[PDB]
Amino acid sequence: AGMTTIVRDLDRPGSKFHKREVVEAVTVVDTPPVVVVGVVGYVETPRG
Amino acid sequence: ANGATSFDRTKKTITPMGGFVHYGEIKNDFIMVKGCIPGNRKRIVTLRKSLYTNTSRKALEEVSLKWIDTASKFGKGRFQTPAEKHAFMGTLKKDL
Amino acid sequence: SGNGAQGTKFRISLGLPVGAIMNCADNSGARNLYIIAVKGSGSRLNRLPAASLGDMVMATVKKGKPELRKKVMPAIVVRQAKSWRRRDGVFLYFEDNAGVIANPKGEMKGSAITGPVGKECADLWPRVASNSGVVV
Amino acid sequence: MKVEIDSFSGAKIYPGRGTLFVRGDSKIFRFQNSKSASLFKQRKNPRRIAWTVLFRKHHKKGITEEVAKKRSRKTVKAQRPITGASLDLIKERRSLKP
Amino acid sequence: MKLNISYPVNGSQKTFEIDDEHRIRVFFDKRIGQEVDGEAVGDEFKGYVFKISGGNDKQGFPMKQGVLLPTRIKLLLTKNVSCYRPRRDGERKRKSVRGAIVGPDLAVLALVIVKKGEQELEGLTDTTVPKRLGPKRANNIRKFFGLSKEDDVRDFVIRREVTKGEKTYTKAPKIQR
RNA sequence: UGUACAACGGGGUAUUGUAAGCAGUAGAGUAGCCUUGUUGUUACGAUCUGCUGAGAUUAAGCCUUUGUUGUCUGAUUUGU
RNA sequence: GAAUGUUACCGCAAUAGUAAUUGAACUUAGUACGAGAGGAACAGUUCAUUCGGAUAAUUGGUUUUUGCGGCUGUCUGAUCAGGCAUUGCCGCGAAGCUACCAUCCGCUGGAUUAUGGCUGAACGCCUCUAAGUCAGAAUCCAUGCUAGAACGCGGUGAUUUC
RNA sequence: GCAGUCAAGCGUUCAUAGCGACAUUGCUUUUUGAUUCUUCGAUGUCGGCUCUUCCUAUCAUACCGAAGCAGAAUUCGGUAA
RNA sequence: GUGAACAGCCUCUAGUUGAUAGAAUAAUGUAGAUAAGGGAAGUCGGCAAAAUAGAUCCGUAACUUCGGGAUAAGGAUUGGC
RNA sequence: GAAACUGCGAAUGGCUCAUUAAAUCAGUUAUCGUUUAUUUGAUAGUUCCUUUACUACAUGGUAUAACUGUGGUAAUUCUAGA
Numbered sequence A: 001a002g003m004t005t006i007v008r009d010l011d012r013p014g015s016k017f018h019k020r021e022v023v024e025a026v027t028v029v030d031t032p033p034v035v036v037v038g039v040v041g042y043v044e045t046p047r048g
Numbered sequence B: 001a002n003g004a005t006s007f008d009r010t011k012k013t014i015t016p017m018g019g020f021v022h023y024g025e026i027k028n029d030f031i032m033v034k035g036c037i038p039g040n041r042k043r044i045v046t047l048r049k050s051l052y053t054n055t056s057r058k059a060l061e062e063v064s065l066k067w068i069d070t071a072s073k074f075g076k077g078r079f080q081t082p083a084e085k086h087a088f089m090g091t092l093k094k095d096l
Numbered sequence C: 001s002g003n004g005a006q007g008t009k010f011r012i013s014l015g016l017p018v019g020a021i022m023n024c025a026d027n028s029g030a031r032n033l034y035i036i037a038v039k040g041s042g043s044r045l046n047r048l049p050a051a052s053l054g055d056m057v058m059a060t061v062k063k064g065k066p067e068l069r070k071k072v073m074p075a076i077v078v079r080q081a082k083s084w085r086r087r088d089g090v091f092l093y094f095e096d097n098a099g100v101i102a103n104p105k106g107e108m109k110g111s112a113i114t115g116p117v118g119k120e121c122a123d124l125w126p127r128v129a130s131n132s133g134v135v136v
Numbered sequence D: 001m002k003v004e005i006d007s008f009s010g011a012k013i014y015p016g017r018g019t020l021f022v023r024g025d026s027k028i029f030r031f032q033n034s035k036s037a038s039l040f041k042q043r044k045n046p047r048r049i050a051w052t053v054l055f056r057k058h059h060k061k062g063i064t065e066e067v068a069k070k071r072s073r074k075t076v077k078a079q080r081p082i083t084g085a086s087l088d089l090i091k092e093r094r095s096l097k098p
Numbered sequence E: 001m002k003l004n005i006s007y008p009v010n011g012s013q014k015t016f017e018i019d020d021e022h023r024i025r026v027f028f029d030k031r032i033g034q035e036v037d038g039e040a041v042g043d044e045f046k047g048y049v050f051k052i053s054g055g056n057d058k059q060g061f062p063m064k065q066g067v068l069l070p071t072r073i074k075l076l077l078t079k080n081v082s083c084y085r086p087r088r089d090g091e092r093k094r095k096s097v098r099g100a101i102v103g104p105d106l107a108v109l110a111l112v113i114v115k116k117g118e119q120e121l122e123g124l125t126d127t128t129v130p131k132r133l134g135p136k137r138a139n140n141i142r143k144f145f146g147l148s149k150e151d152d153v154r155d156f157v158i159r160r161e162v163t164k165g166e167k168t169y170t171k172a173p174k175i176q177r
Numbered sequence F: 001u002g003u004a005c006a007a008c009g010g011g012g013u014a015u016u017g018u019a020a021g022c023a024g025u026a027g028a029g030u031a032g033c034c035u036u037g038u039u040g041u042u043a044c045g046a047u048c049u050g051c052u053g054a055g056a057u058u059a060a061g062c063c064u065u066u067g068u069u070g071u072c073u074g075a076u077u078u079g080u
Numbered sequence G: 001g002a003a004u005g006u007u008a009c010c011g012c013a014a015u016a017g018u019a020a021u022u023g024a025a026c027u028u029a030g031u032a033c034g035a036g037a038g039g040a041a042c043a044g045u046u047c048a049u050u051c052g053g054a055u056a057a058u059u060g061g062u063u064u065u066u067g068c069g070g071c072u073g074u075c076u077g078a079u080c081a082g083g084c085a086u087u088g089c090c091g092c093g094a095a096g097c098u099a100c101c102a103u104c105c106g107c108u109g110g111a112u113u114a115u116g117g118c119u120g121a122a123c124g125c126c127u128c129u130a131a132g133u134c135a136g137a138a139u140c141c142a143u144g145c146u147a148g149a150a151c152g153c154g155g156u157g158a159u160u161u162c
Numbered sequence H: 001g002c003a004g005u006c007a008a009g010c011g012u013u014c015a016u017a018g019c020g021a022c023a024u025u026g027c028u029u030u031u032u033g034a035u036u037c038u039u040c041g042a043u044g045u046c047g048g049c050u051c052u053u054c055c056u057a058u059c060a061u062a063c064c065g066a067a068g069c070a071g072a073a074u075u076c077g078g079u080a081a
Numbered sequence I: 001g002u003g004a005a006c007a008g009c010c011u012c013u014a015g016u017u018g019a020u021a022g023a024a025u026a027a028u029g030u031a032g033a034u035a036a037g038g039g040a041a042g043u044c045g046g047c048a049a050a051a052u053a054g055a056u057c058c059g060u061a062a063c064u065u066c067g068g069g070a071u072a073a074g075g076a077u078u079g080g081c
Numbered sequence J: 001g002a003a004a005c006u007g008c009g010a011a012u013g014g015c016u017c018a019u020u021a022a023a024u025c026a027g028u029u030a031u032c033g034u035u036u037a038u039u040u041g042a043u044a045g046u047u048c049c050u051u052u053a054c055u056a057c058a059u060g061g062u063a064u065a066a067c068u069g070u071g072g073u074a075a076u077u078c079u080a081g082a
């Protein structure tokens, strides 16, 4: 669907931004339930 | 309150004012993933379980969002919500 | 950055390639700094080395005391003008370019620093912190 | 997370967004966008640009009932008396007569 | 951040520490003078109304009514003004000041109870410290009793007992006017 | 022939920076007629102000729609 | 893109390609070693270089959105509203494109080389080697990643009567 | 131009840690000569820019053996393009 | 008409509206423009390009054949009513 | 009699010779051309209100230090709320 921005404190002992906020890009993907309609079974062969 | 957080709280969904440019609304569940991804808006996209147990510290860090941006993307968006916009602007020549 | 650098630095937009001239912001006698190199820079066919906030550069002094001209010295970039973006999300920029002349170890020739100073540079170079007024 | 405001226009600046200019003296001017930032560089006067806060604040635009009355006036009245003096002889001599 | 709360009816005072960025958040963007309902700040204070009257940021610089701004600035102050006591006649000093709009950077908020809530606050509503001093000017006595200039004021002057170990002495002001 | 599809229209979202019209004790000021001023009168005046964050534009690769109007069998080819 | 009944969908994997790179800081540690002067490394951490593949939430650039506003000259009697000036000029400018000028991401198993070893004869002694065998590198083969043989292949759907 | 063999000498002592005379065996075809076989009814000449690939006689980077290797630094050698 | 102007730009009279056309807007072009921060580091070489420009006022160096050099250089200013 | 308010003083003193060439400075003038805390001496019967059902003069108003108490800052002759 798209992108937006995020703010969060960062947790990383050792870094100059430990316990400081950061602002970060995120994408959003639309994800309604998938529906199951079949099963397929594979077997191993010397051809793969 | 999809787009709300513990710290934000203001009931609002992830859909930016005016709605995701070139897509629409997001009325289903979603996956928000840090950063950016191959493919473009509207394209089918497969998300896959990782092939190795990464340790990284970077992986492992349990994030907790403080605030999700939600202003329009169709310009230099100034307001998170019609509510905010109503607040700041005052009364207009339309309206009640 | 490199030697005498207390700490590390997150990457910030390179603003001053070789031949850039920046205001001299200490009381050392130097009026300007001509950048001839950037310490710890890398190599790409045709790429100019370029410095940013809190970088050690090799430099010469083109306007200033005669006792300070015709010779190469170390110096440290304190103001930038080319906008960079911090990890707190902000794009920010100064109204000019400026460093102060320093010795390999990062100690400063001059006693004071005139004008504001980027935080990412105070952080790096303690002797520079010392002499600052307004940081960032 | 502070929401900032536009030095020129008076507009809310949500995190990471617009640009930040640090002037010679050390006045930190914050813009929410290149529009403010250009007018600013052009030495434009916010009070003469009609869509700005300062313009409106100045030309008294749409404060409306912000200059109206209210309901804020206390309620108390209680006798402590005066320290050292027996506050148990500060009401049975406080009987008035007018 | 600490909260310096005063009940001016009883002339009491007690402080309160509140570590809840949510319970705090009610106070931000509010200026000095504005009132605040209580429930938001704690289940204790439900019903209470608080008037915001000042405070200090971490760094200790004070709030100053009517700056607006939620940041600091350096003003030029004079006689008869808050956050400055002149050392010399005609002296003005340029000093930093914290603005009157409350923000997370405040070390302490200064609050004054205006109207009481639904339940007593520990060392505040339950204890009552008295005035220190009483009327000294003739007519002020006549009004802290309501007297009509015929009643004679020498009698209503206040009397403060005091011990000299085994002598209990008694002192009154000196009526002026 | 239906959660259809389209063209409009409406609402959101944006961009600009306050439309046209009218009005005014705003305006450097200027003329014209006398009943020659105890705001004399009738107009003209760059610009300003109010109605008015107005007007305009906004998918052409923005979002959305209980409204309006329309559309919904032509062509060719394929076989173990 | 013809032909392998037609057409559709989901897959396999032969062969070919293949990718990551280097540095610093902290810490180890003023430690080991050293009369002293000097003075390391492994484990851990934070960043960076050079390369690569994407991506456009943010910021920057681009402007025929000729979208809104402003300006010169002229033309339409004035007004409104416009035309012309090889896109007249200027400020802002969404959308798209886009930049180490912006952001995100760049996998872990095995087998080996050199070399150091085990057991061990030749040669009653000795030997890493002759037989047999352990550990091992920015190597190699896999994993992973890109293509998919248009004459390599599998599973599945529906298959025309005037 | 690059690499060997002998080992007098160098290296405080000590031929070969690192080197190495007098001699002597080679390799290489970015040197320069020697030649004149191909092109004179025409194979566009220097250098740079751009860009790909290959060689290894390896400068860096990985793992090693050695030292006249205490540490630090360095030098010599192997597997390595 | 603007303007110093037979300039450029717009107009009246007259004269044209001729010059294959349609649909799209990939690469690479030809011609026209813009670009953050830096500022010749590019290159044989600032090639190309950019900058400057009218008028009024102020100000103007070396040197000189005293005629110049000179719009030297450097500055302010300019609409409408 | 601490603290504090109020008043007065801190414009004297002490120091130095940087600037300064008709400036300063000197001797001599002027104020019929001005301001002057102070010291000294003089100096004030009038204050109200259309001037009989009258105005606190036997004397009109609060708001502040010190203080009490709640506090902030690493830090100063910092100071906030009550």
Ligand SMILES: COc1ccc(C[C@H]2NC[C@H](O)[C@H]2OC(C)=O)cc1
Residues within 6 Å of the ligand: H039, H042, H043, H045
């Ligand atoms: C000394 O530099 C040069 C000498 C000779 C040539 C030409 C020859 N090259 C090959 C043939 O013999 C002739 O080719 C042609 C095309 O004429 C070029 C450069």
Ligand SMILES: [Mg+2]
Residues within 6 Å of the ligand: B072, B073, B074, B075, B076
């Ligand atoms: Mg946008």
Ligand SMILES: [Mg+2]
Residues within 6 Å of the ligand: C024, C025, C026, C114
């Ligand atoms: Mg200076």
Ligand SMILES: [Mg+2]
Residues within 6 Å of the ligand: C045, C046
């Ligand atoms: Mg080059």
Ligand SMILES: [Mg+2]
Residues within 6 Å of the ligand: none
């Ligand atoms: Mg010179």
Ligand SMILES: [Mg+2]
Residues within 6 Å of the ligand: C111, C130, C131
């Ligand atoms: Mg110092």
Ligand SMILES: [Mg+2]
Residues within 6 Å of the ligand: D034
């Ligand atoms: Mg711009």
Ligand SMILES: [Mg+2]
Residues within 6 Å of the ligand: D034
């Ligand atoms: Mg832009």
Ligand SMILES: [Mg+2]
Residues within 6 Å of the ligand: E176, E177
């Ligand atoms: Mg008295």
Ligand SMILES: [Mg+2]
Residues within 6 Å of the ligand: F006, F007, F070, F071
């Ligand atoms: Mg239709």
Ligand SMILES: [Mg+2]
Residues within 6 Å of the ligand: F018, F052, F054
């Ligand atoms: Mg308006």
Ligand SMILES: [Mg+2]
Residues within 6 Å of the ligand: none
């Ligand atoms: Mg297209």
Ligand SMILES: [Mg+2]
Residues within 6 Å of the ligand: F009, F010, F067
């Ligand atoms: Mg409708």
Ligand SMILES: [Mg+2]
Residues within 6 Å of the ligand: none
């Ligand atoms: Mg076929």
Ligand SMILES: [Mg+2]
Residues within 6 Å of the ligand: G029, G030
């Ligand atoms: Mg140490």
Ligand SMILES: [Mg+2]
Residues within 6 Å of the ligand: none
């Ligand atoms: Mg020794």
